[PDB]
Amino acid sequence: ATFAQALQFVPETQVSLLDNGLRVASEQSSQPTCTVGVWIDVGSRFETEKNNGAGYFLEHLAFKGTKNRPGSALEKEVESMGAHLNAYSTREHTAYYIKALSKDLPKAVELLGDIVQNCSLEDSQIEKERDVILREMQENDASMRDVVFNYLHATAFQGTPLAQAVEGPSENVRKLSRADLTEYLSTHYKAPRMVLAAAGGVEHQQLLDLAQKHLGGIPWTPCRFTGSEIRHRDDALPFAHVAIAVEGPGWASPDNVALQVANAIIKLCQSFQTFSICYAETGLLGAHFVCDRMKIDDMMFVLQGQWMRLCTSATESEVARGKNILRNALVSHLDGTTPVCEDIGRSLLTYGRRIPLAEWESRIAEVDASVVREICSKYIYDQCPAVAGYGPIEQLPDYNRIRSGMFWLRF
Amino acid sequence: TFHPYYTIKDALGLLLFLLSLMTLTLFSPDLLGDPDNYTLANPLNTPPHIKPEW
């Protein structure tokens, strides 16, 4: 029927708590496939300088061998089942998930346990991963958007442990011994810091039984935003990359929805996007655009003018359009077993509960033009920003010019 | 860019220049002057120490 009724149609995600602390969540559906994964509340933010690349290295070698079966055997079993075994690591989250058939739900869950509980850190495999990661860092150096975002994080958080990259420095990965990885696993991969989330054609009782069988052996038991800038000049690069951000509220904040609407509200730029990267207690709200050498200043002016217009003069039609865009993006994102499973895991990790879609719609409905402009002025207006520019960066206005453009003399 | 850096640097220069000028006009207005210029011009007698401005 209506949008609200359709949201009510969405099945709930049953959540149970094991004895050791593991939080098992599921969302029953009629799909013949499923995606079962383990989300660990451990990331680059929790890593000191000694082991900045520990989590990434463990992500690399997790699928290359467990104690019960060698890495070749594990990969062969995954391939024979027809499933896809994938993993990712952010500065605050880690995840190992398996996209499989519903009838393969048991084995897959067991597999996850073998990946998490008893991980085999073969020294030869560790050296192979060292070589591979040393190659991979140089490979990733080509992608300038990720380099720009890493620059932005490093300059924005600096002294905070939130500024170090997920990959970690070359010297760190070179010297990252096996004992360091084992200590990282021991101190980090432990319930209740973990969530086993599944979606698709899965029954919550079956998932709970499998979690108790294979994930019951797990042991029972100041962020600061600095408005700095970084600009790496390289005129040989064809286009300049710019990412400018300001402090954003963490996961637990009602203002996130209004900021999402404002970003949705926001062509000189060849490719211009708006990001609202949220963390536990901090966040980066801003824009990333690619530019010609001769048009950086105009694009920065246009973006800051849009920011000021939202902060001061936010009309009702634009806010309604932003709310509709946000609703459509929210509903369309949660299409497919993998996206909903990832949402379940992350939401349990950050928000708690699962924040159903009806509450999201009600919160969006609360949002108003007055609310949009008030929150934008709260977070954007007259705030010292963090800027990251990858060459050719010469026409990019100096930090004082950008900071001055962060406010209006007419207002 | 000259707008956010040398504008304030010049403004400070203007402030210092006005400081010097106002102290020169308000405390020693005749420091850089010649007293003989305060007598009405007399084309029949050249002052003993006729000199141009400094």
Residues of A forming the active site: 59
| CA distances from residue A77 to A127, A391, B43 in whole angstroms, order as listed | 24, 46, 119
Burial of A143: CB neighbours in 10 Å, binned 0-12, 13-18, 19+: exposed
The residue in chain B having the minimum alpha-carbon distance to the alpha carbon of residue A398 is B1
Amino acid at B41: A
Q: Is A187 exposed, middle or buried (0-12, 13-18, 19+ CB in 10 A)?
A: exposed
Nearest chain B CA: its distance from A303 CA (Å): 20
Structure determined by: cryo-EM
B1 and chain A in contact, CB less than 8 A:
yes
> What whole-number distance in Å separates Cα of residue A65 and Cα of residue A72?
7
Kindly give the pairing relationship between strand A386-390 and strand A229-232: parallel
For chain A, which residues lie within 8 Å of any Cβ of chain B, measuring from their own Cβ?
A: 397-398, 400-401, 404
Separation in Å, CA of A399 to nearest CA in chain B = 10
CA distance A155 to A268: 26
Identity at B18, one-letter amino acid code:
L
Element (H, E) at A88: strand A84-89
CA distance A355 to A347: 7
How many CB contacts within 8 angstroms connect chain A with chain B?
10
Find the Cα–Cα–Cα–Cα dihedral A72, A77, A83, A84, rounded to 10°: -10
Sign of CA pseudo-dihedral B27, B29, B30, B32:
positive
d(CA A307, CA A318): 13
- Helix A255-265 to helix A357-366 angle, to the nearest 10 degrees? 70
Side by side, the strands of the sheet bearing A240-247 are A229-232, A386-390, A240-247, A283-291, A271-278
Beta bridge partners of A283: A278
Name residues 5-34 of chain B within 8 A of A (Cβ): 5
Q: List, in sequence order, the alpha helices (H) in A271-315.
A: 296-312
What are the chain A neighbours of B5 within 8 Å (beta carbons)? 398, 400
CB within 8 Å: B1 and A397: yes
Between the alpha carbon of residue A73 and those of residues A38, A64, A76, A78, A79, the distances in Å are 21, 9, 5, 9, 10
CA-closest candidate to residue A393, choices A286, A293, A290, A271: A293
Tokens of A15: 């959540």
Strand, coil or helix: what is A268?
coil
Report chain breaks in chain B, C–N > 2.5 Å, as residues after which they occur.
Answer: none
**With an 8 Å Cβ cutoff, is B4 touching chain A?**
yes
CA distances from A392 to A134, A137, A287, A298, A396 (A): 26, 22, 18, 15, 9
Number of helices (H), then strands (E), belonging to chain A: the values are 16, 11
Handedness of CA A210, A212, A213, A218 (dihedral sign): positive
Buried b (16+ CB within 10 A) or exposed e, A111-141: bbbbbbbebbbeeebbeebbeebeeebeeee
CA distance A219 to A216: 8
Sheet holding A94-101, edge to edge: A14-17, A23-26, A194-198, A33-40, A94-101, A84-89
